[model samples]
Target chain A: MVSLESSRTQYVNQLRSHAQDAATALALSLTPNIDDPAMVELLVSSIFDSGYYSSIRVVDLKTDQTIVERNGIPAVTNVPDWFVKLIGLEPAGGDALVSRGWEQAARVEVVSHPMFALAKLWQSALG
Target chain B: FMVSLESSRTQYVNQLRSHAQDAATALALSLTPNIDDPAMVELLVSSIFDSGYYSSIRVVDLKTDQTIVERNGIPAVTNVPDWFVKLIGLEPAGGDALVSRGWEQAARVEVVSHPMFALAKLWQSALG
Candidate 1:
């Protein structure tokens, strides 16, 4: 029988780890130079490459227009689908509102892919 | 840009179709249902999103005609010049997959891919 106590503990730990990653991603987003499109694209691409996020996008907060967007690479494909829903590791991502001086510039969005969560679940199941 | 006499029209067309089929098959595989768990339907959709290829994946219950799950990519490259797109003529491709819970049919997954990335590739090739 699976121990509820152990499962909850593991779940919370994973949740907290993802939360920190989100915070870092948000911090990264806030540090970009909004005036330069090349810089914006470069920064967004860097975050997406970190593999901590599933999707990363920057949008104009005023016009609600996407400046650049990219998604994560899938790590494992054969994992069971049921385990994913049960854990529900959908990270809506960290949305950080950026500003240039007093003017609102853009919003950066980041998401986590399910593979990391799936890996955690597999570890939990085996234990 | 005028097509170079060296550019093979047939080769370019074949390459585009191959990319489209690969995308469609990847989506269809992701939508495959796990009959034992009905909740898996949502995960299937999420899995496709994680793959990051399609613009969106929708699971619609045929009987009710209701959408059970839907996930879409961020707004694609809308600024690609129209002339460049028309020159390539690479249309977006989509396909459907059926899901079931044993004897009971569940829903169909309607998947659509954005052609922006493909367009980017085609444009790069044309320029070269």
Candidate 2:
């Protein structure tokens, strides 16, 4: 039988690993087409549609301006407050600079969803 | 008319934040846990959210990182366009406290507000 203490520790580790993997994927997905506006828009839309992020925005390197921005779908009401406050999943966004053959073109920022954290916490609490 | 819509958007956003703040303050004041009773917290959270004043209510145990209660609601405004709702972004407002039963600390209460009042007000503003 798994002890509660051990279970909690494992859960926390799983949560962290999941978050890291999602962040890495988001960054890698945006790295390739940072210079192409059309591709960038498509990628941003796809990520946003995945409903696994809080917000995503892209900026132009030279102009220092935001060219695309999207907010994640709102969390469902069943999610708990303590989970949100404790984990503080406000935004996990990171900027990845994109270059077009030596010319820096843009930066992409991606924020992952905290629903997974909430779900894990909720499940553990239930058990 | 376009200017009116712009004003409506601003008013809607401001009012949503304001209500969220009010709900947070109210929860902070009313939901303090005097006993380490999960039932009490559940009842209290439900009562507050049922008043149609908040989007969600939650009670948490700081010691265990355990959530005692959680509930949520959406804006009930029927007049506002879906586009208007989409355009206005409202962050969840929250209030918290660490309560104690004697020397040991109890649970924490947090409350979030719904955007109903704001949506209604914005719709009215747009009518101008």
Candidate 3:
């Protein structure tokens, strides 16, 4: 059986390749200007596409706190009802290790909100 | 009139959005164990080719003794190398349109495999 560490590294490579490819293909410009809304939005969107699941904060280790958060929106495109219902999923913990110590850390459990996950599967299978 | 398609900022933003969507779609799933199947392999290959840049389907049937199928939209690039198509078939599974001003294009066909997404360096660099 493949260990978790092995699996983690595998996905990490994919994420990196995606990022590098995007940067190269588009010649992305770097801006130290995070204060700009346009820049921030661009960064967030790029980060998501690069396949990294992360939480960001302006604080260091001493200031953050545990927060379990799940953001769900109504179905946008022509996705399935089953998927929409499936996506009405359980709340996931969002405690960061920096905030909560290792023992209490949430480990960043990344989920695909079953609805979207199923939709992708269907796309792969049929679309 | 929506005449000129080249608003530098808007075009750049659209490019970023397309790449970002591509990345998210690629990473939004649980990782799969293997990607040796032909159909799966084809999908992966297509994903790597930028939609506007490359237009060709390339693959080798590893299951059927590595029989090849290579086609390209560009007549000059016809008969894509067989060995080149087999890279994704070797266990590692791994697009775009340019639209005029305010026009839209779909870059990725669908979400990529989860394992491939998490295993990327871009994920680490971007997050870090």
Evaluated with lDDT, which candidate comes out highest?
2
Range of the 10 consecutive residues with the lowest summed lDDT in candidate 2 chain A = A105-114
Best by DockQ: 3
For each candidate in turn, the TM-score is 0.26, 0.29, 0.24
Model 3: how far is A54 from its true place, Å? 5.3
User: lDDT tens digits, residues A1-127, model 3?
Assistant: 1224454454445544553444333212222432253553465355444332222112111223311211222112234556435334332111111112222211111112222233333343333
Scored by TM-score, the top model is 2
Q: What is the C-alpha lDDT profile of model 1 across A86-127, one tens digit per residue?
A: 444333232233234454433322232234334434444544
Tens digit per residue, CA lDDT, model 2, B1-128: 34454453444344444445555445544544332455765665565454333445555444455555666544222335566655543333322223233454322212122333334344444555
DockQ of each: 0.02, 0.02, 0.02
The CAPRI-style docking tier of model 2 reads incorrect
> For residue A10, what is the lDDT in candidate 3?
48
CAPRI tier for the interface of model 3: incorrect
Q: Tens digits of per-residue lDDT for model 2 on A1-127?
A: 1223443343334333433444345445555555466875787677555323445555444454666666532333244566445434333222233234454433322222233334434444444
> What's the number of clashes in each of the models?
1, 2, 26
Relative to the unseen true structure, what is the Cα RMSD of model 1? 25.2
Alpha carbon deviation, residue B7, candidate 3 (Å): 27
